[PDB]
Scaffold this active site. Structure first.
Site, PDB file in Angstrom:
ATOM      1  N   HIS A 142     -11.422   3.223  16.275  1.00  9.32           N
ATOM      2  CA  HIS A 142     -12.609   2.443  16.539  1.00  9.32           C
ATOM      3  C   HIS A 142     -12.233   0.980  16.701  1.00  9.32           C
ATOM      4  O   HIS A 142     -12.526   0.343  17.705  1.00  9.32           O
ATOM      5  CB  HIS A 142     -13.559   2.621  15.355  1.00  9.32           C
ATOM      6  CG  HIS A 142     -14.723   1.674  15.485  1.00  9.32           C
ATOM      7  ND1 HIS A 142     -15.990   2.086  15.739  1.00  9.32           N
ATOM      8  CD2 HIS A 142     -14.740   0.293  15.271  1.00  9.32           C
ATOM      9  CE1 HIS A 142     -16.752   0.977  15.671  1.00  9.32           C
ATOM     10  NE2 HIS A 142     -16.031  -0.111  15.391  1.00  9.32           N
ATOM     11  N   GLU A 143     -11.445   0.500  15.727  1.00 11.76           N
ATOM     12  CA  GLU A 143     -11.070  -0.930  15.769  1.00 11.76           C
ATOM     13  C   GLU A 143     -10.122  -1.250  16.904  1.00 11.76           C
ATOM     14  O   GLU A 143     -10.304  -2.268  17.595  1.00 11.76           O
ATOM     15  CB  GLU A 143     -10.509  -1.426  14.428  1.00 11.76           C
ATOM     16  CG  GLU A 143     -11.618  -1.555  13.361  1.00 11.76           C
ATOM     17  CD  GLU A 143     -12.714  -2.483  13.718  1.00 11.76           C
ATOM     18  OE1 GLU A 143     -12.592  -3.510  14.390  1.00 11.76           O
ATOM     19  OE2 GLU A 143     -13.852  -2.173  13.271  1.00 11.76           O
ATOM     20  N   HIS A 146     -11.798  -1.943  20.100  1.00 13.85           N
ATOM     21  CA  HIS A 146     -12.405  -3.285  20.368  1.00 13.85           C
ATOM     22  C   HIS A 146     -11.423  -4.143  21.157  1.00 13.85           C
ATOM     23  O   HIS A 146     -11.821  -4.966  21.982  1.00 13.85           O
ATOM     24  CB  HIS A 146     -12.706  -3.978  19.043  1.00 13.85           C
ATOM     25  CG  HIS A 146     -14.001  -3.508  18.429  1.00 13.85           C
ATOM     26  ND1 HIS A 146     -15.161  -3.471  19.170  1.00 13.85           N
ATOM     27  CD2 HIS A 146     -14.280  -3.127  17.150  1.00 13.85           C
ATOM     28  CE1 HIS A 146     -16.134  -3.046  18.367  1.00 13.85           C
ATOM     29  NE2 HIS A 146     -15.682  -2.834  17.142  1.00 13.85           N
ATOM     30  N   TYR A 157     -20.524  -9.871  21.317  1.00 13.82           N
ATOM     31  CA  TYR A 157     -20.757  -9.175  20.050  1.00 13.82           C
ATOM     32  C   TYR A 157     -22.129  -9.499  19.495  1.00 13.82           C
ATOM     33  O   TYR A 157     -22.286  -9.991  18.369  1.00 13.82           O
ATOM     34  CB  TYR A 157     -19.612  -9.542  19.094  1.00 13.82           C
ATOM     35  CG  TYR A 157     -19.430  -8.511  18.027  1.00 13.82           C
ATOM     36  CD1 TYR A 157     -18.776  -7.338  18.402  1.00 13.82           C
ATOM     37  CD2 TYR A 157     -19.870  -8.684  16.726  1.00 13.82           C
ATOM     38  CE1 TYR A 157     -18.545  -6.356  17.459  1.00 13.82           C
ATOM     39  CE2 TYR A 157     -19.682  -7.683  15.787  1.00 13.82           C
ATOM     40  CZ  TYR A 157     -19.023  -6.551  16.177  1.00 13.82           C
ATOM     41  OH  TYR A 157     -18.787  -5.520  15.335  1.00 13.82           O
ATOM     42  N   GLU A 166     -20.015  -1.713  19.981  1.00 10.61           N
ATOM     43  CA  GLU A 166     -19.832  -0.838  18.804  1.00 10.61           C
ATOM     44  C   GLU A 166     -19.859   0.656  19.139  1.00 10.61           C
ATOM     45  O   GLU A 166     -19.050   1.405  18.582  1.00 10.61           O
ATOM     46  CB  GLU A 166     -20.944  -1.076  17.749  1.00 10.61           C
ATOM     47  CG  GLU A 166     -20.786  -2.375  16.939  1.00 10.61           C
ATOM     48  CD  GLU A 166     -19.488  -2.269  16.232  1.00 10.61           C
ATOM     49  OE1 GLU A 166     -18.911  -1.362  15.599  1.00 10.61           O
ATOM     50  OE2 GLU A 166     -18.619  -3.109  16.208  1.00 10.61           O
ATOM     51  N   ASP A 226     -27.313  -8.648  11.384  1.00  9.49           N
ATOM     52  CA  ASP A 226     -26.206  -7.871  11.954  1.00  9.49           C
ATOM     53  C   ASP A 226     -25.983  -8.254  13.392  1.00  9.49           C
ATOM     54  O   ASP A 226     -25.946  -7.418  14.294  1.00  9.49           O
ATOM     55  CB  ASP A 226     -26.558  -6.385  11.763  1.00  9.49           C
ATOM     56  CG  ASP A 226     -25.521  -5.408  12.238  1.00  9.49           C
ATOM     57  OD1 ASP A 226     -24.326  -5.713  12.078  1.00  9.49           O
ATOM     58  OD2 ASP A 226     -25.839  -4.314  12.759  1.00  9.49           O
ATOM     59  N   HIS A 231     -24.533  -2.880  14.693  1.00  8.81           N
ATOM     60  CA  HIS A 231     -24.126  -1.653  14.070  1.00  8.81           C
ATOM     61  C   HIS A 231     -25.318  -0.682  13.900  1.00  8.81           C
ATOM     62  O   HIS A 231     -25.057   0.458  13.565  1.00  8.81           O
ATOM     63  CB  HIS A 231     -23.559  -1.790  12.642  1.00  8.81           C
ATOM     64  CG  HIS A 231     -22.384  -2.716  12.676  1.00  8.81           C
ATOM     65  ND1 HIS A 231     -22.435  -4.085  12.460  1.00  8.81           N
ATOM     66  CD2 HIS A 231     -21.087  -2.360  12.893  1.00  8.81           C
ATOM     67  CE1 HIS A 231     -21.206  -4.576  12.553  1.00  8.81           C
ATOM     68  NE2 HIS A 231     -20.427  -3.544  12.792  1.00  8.81           N
TER      69      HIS A 231
HETATM   70 ZN   LIG Z   1     -16.725  -2.061  15.620  1.00 13.39          ZN
END
Ligand SMILES: [Zn+2]
Ligand SMILES: [Ca+2]
Ligand SMILES: [Ca+2]
Ligand SMILES: [Ca+2]
Ligand SMILES: [Ca+2]
Length: 316
Positions: A142-143, A146, A157, A166, A226, A231
């Site tokens: 997932h990371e 990015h 973002y 996301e 957020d 998210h």
């Molecule tokens: Zn993320």
């Protein structure tokens, strides 16, 4: 470091034994010279200064409990690199074999892991909410995804472009988890979240509402927390991606699944060729419809299933 490429052995966060690519030069370092310009894993030693020291070990055996998070950060960065290379023909996150660097043991009791713009950073968790976050292959992927997004669409973002950002990370994190065949599923972070509670996870792509996230555009979060819900509102796209792949009927709309592989080809194409920094959900749908059209034809079932899925979550 300049040295001789070799192979060491260790244990990851979950206790599983794995071989990892290391480099020898007096000490054995977590430096994998077999993928691109290299994969490098550092010890941040419980501080927040980055990246820390390149991980050095005296005998090429990483079975200490302090070694665990490093072994998995190093190994799962290699699996993610392989996924993107073998499946999408992408060499590293910039497409030209950039080196991938990760630091583990960042800060103390830190319940998060992130791509900071230049490298991966992993907390060890507090031991109750999380255990070391690099033990989750879908978190690592997932990371790392990015970083791909940063070099291609560049989605900002916040608000809907952040939620897409996301969701794209959850989708590919999930496809990498299926590619490694590590007990795969459509949930995110279940291997490292709450060691004391079986069956839960951070988020669910197959049923985002299980944890309270929206599964339909009419339920989106419109406030400011957020960064405008990046998210929370990713649930709407995650539910669409799950339906395109797996199929199902959602708020009365029926979707024939076309499978994970085509799901990954459509979204990778949409991400690297049609999305822009400020794309919103409606232009994500157009981008995925156009991608599916490019790959399978405007009268394919694949195009039809992309349209139905976005119609099922209320995105026009
Ligand atoms: Zn993320
Ligand atoms: Ca050792
Ligand atoms: Ca799993
Ligand atoms: Ca998972
Ligand atoms: Ca749990």
């Amino acid at each position: 470091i300049t040295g001789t490429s070799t192979v060491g052995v260790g244990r990851g966060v979950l206790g599983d034994q794995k071989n990892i690519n290391t480099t020898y030069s007096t000490y054995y370092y977590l430096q994998d010279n077999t993928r691109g310009d290299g994969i490098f894993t550092y010890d941040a030693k419980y501080r927040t200064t980055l990246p820390g020291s390149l991980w050095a070990d005296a005998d090429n055996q990483f079975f200490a409990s302090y070694d665990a998070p490093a072994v998995d950060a190093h190994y799962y960065a290699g699996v993610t690199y392989d996924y993107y290379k073998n499946v999408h023909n992408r060499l590293s996150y910039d497409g030209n074999n950039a080196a991938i660097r990760s630091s583990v043991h960042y800060s103390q009791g830190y319940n998060n892991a992130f791509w900071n713009g230049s490298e991966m950073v992993y907390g060890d968790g507090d031991g109750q909410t999380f255990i070391p976050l690099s033990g989750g292959i879908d978190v690592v992927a997932h990371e790392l995804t990015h970083a791909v997004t940063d070099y291609t669409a560049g989605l900002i973002y916040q608000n809907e472009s952040g939620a897409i950002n996301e969701a794209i990370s959850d989708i590919f994190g999930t496809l990498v988890e299926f590619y490694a065949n590590k007990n795969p599923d459509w949930e995110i972070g279940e291997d490292v979240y709450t060691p004391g509670i079986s069956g839960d996870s951070l988020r669910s792509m197959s049923d985002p509402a299980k944890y309270g996230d929206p599964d339909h555009y009419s339920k989106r979060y419109t406030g400011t927390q957020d960064n405008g819900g990046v998210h929370i509102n990713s649930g709407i796209i995650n539910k669409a991606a799950y339906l395109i792949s797996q199929g199902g009927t959602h708020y009365g709309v029926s979707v024939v699944g076309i499978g994970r592989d085509k799901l990954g080809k459509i979204f990778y194409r949409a991400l690297t060729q049609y999305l822009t920094p400020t794309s919103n959900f409606s232009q994500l749908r157009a981008a995925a419809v156009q991608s599916a059209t490019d790959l399978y034809g405007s009268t394919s079932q694949e195009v039809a299933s992309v349209k139905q899925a976005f119609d099922a979550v209320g995105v026009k």
